[PDB]
Amino acid sequence: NLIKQKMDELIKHLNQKIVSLKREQQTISEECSANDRLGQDLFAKLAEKVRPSEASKFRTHVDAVGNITSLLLSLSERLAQTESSLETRQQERGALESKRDLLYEQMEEAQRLKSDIERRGVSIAGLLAKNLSADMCADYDYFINMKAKLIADARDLAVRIKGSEEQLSSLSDA
Amino acid sequence: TNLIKQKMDELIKHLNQKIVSLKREQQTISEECSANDRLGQDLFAKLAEKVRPSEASKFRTHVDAVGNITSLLLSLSERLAQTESSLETRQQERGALESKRDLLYEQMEEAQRLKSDIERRGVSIAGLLAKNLSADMCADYDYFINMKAKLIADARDLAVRIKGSEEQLSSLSDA
């Protein structure tokens, strides 16, 4: 509601900006044509006095100046871009490393907890053995182990499914 | 009929098929869990009959804890894996970018050599004009060449800024 309100504004200001930039670049273009005319006059007057090869060399020097200027600027820009992207990658990597630290601590905690649960499980086995038939006990063992196993399998299938769904989405989208 | 389109359709159809089958197997597992769980319930009924309430509660709690911790460890190992596979990528991307940077650096050194050569050649040209042209003409030439360079620079700048503004505009044309 109010987001389109701001967005329209931004888009507008930005269009105005781009139009201005266009204008300025036009001005510069004109100045370029003028200066080129100057160079043309120069080359004519020099073409009068000197040998053809010398005039040619003059011309190629004049072109070369512009060329190497544009080249240097281009490489400068590209370099800058690359630097920027690298820095970005670095920040991202830092974030990921932190996330990893966290995951790890949580894992250690989870392990501690699992050990605890294992001992408790010893206790439970004790309780069942003291209160239920051998059959019922073997049945419990089977039950608990199968519970774990089934959870595992289920998560595996959940993952495979999820991922494959991602793949599909990406393909179909193309 | 275009091959690639065809192969793609075949591909996504395969994906659909296997997704269906996977859903199937998943349902199977689901029902299994149902059964095994009924088993649990029966066990607990028995024990509950033969034992004090707190002990039955401990049993229940342990039975729940096994499952919960299984799940937790599983999801943690998963998240961990994904994280490491993200790192492995942020590695290769970085390496590639760095190679590109190398190339750009070599190109820059080269281009600098070039600028130097063009410079000395420019000295010679200056000599030529000196010999054949009036001082006014030579001054005019120095001006012209300087202004050429400056104008190229400014035009470059404007071109870049325009490009950027356009990037922003277009990217905002979506949201």
UniProtKB/Swiss-Prot annotation, chain B:
Residues 1-175 form the ASD2 domain. Disruption phenotype: During axis elongation in the embryo decreases localization to adherens junctions and planar polarization for both Rho-kinase Rok and myosin regulatory light chain sqh. The mislocalization of sqh impairs the generation of sustained actomyosin contractility during cell rearrangement and can account for the reduction in the formation of multicellular rosette and convergent extension. RNAi-mediated knockdown in the embryo decreases Rho-kinase Rok localization to adherens junctions and planar polarization during axis elongation. Has no effect on Rho1 localization or activity. Binds to Rho-kinase Rok and targets it to the apical cell cortex where it mediates apical constriction. During embryogenic axis elongation, required for the localization to adherens junctions and the establishment of planar polarization of both Rho-kinase Rok and myosin regulatory light chain sqh. May be involved in the assembly of microtubule arrays during cell elongation. Monomer or homodimer. Interacts with Rok. Belongs to the shroom family. The ASD2 domain mediates the interaction with Rok and is required for apical constriction induction. This is Protein Shroom. It comes from Drosophila melanogaster (Fruit fly).
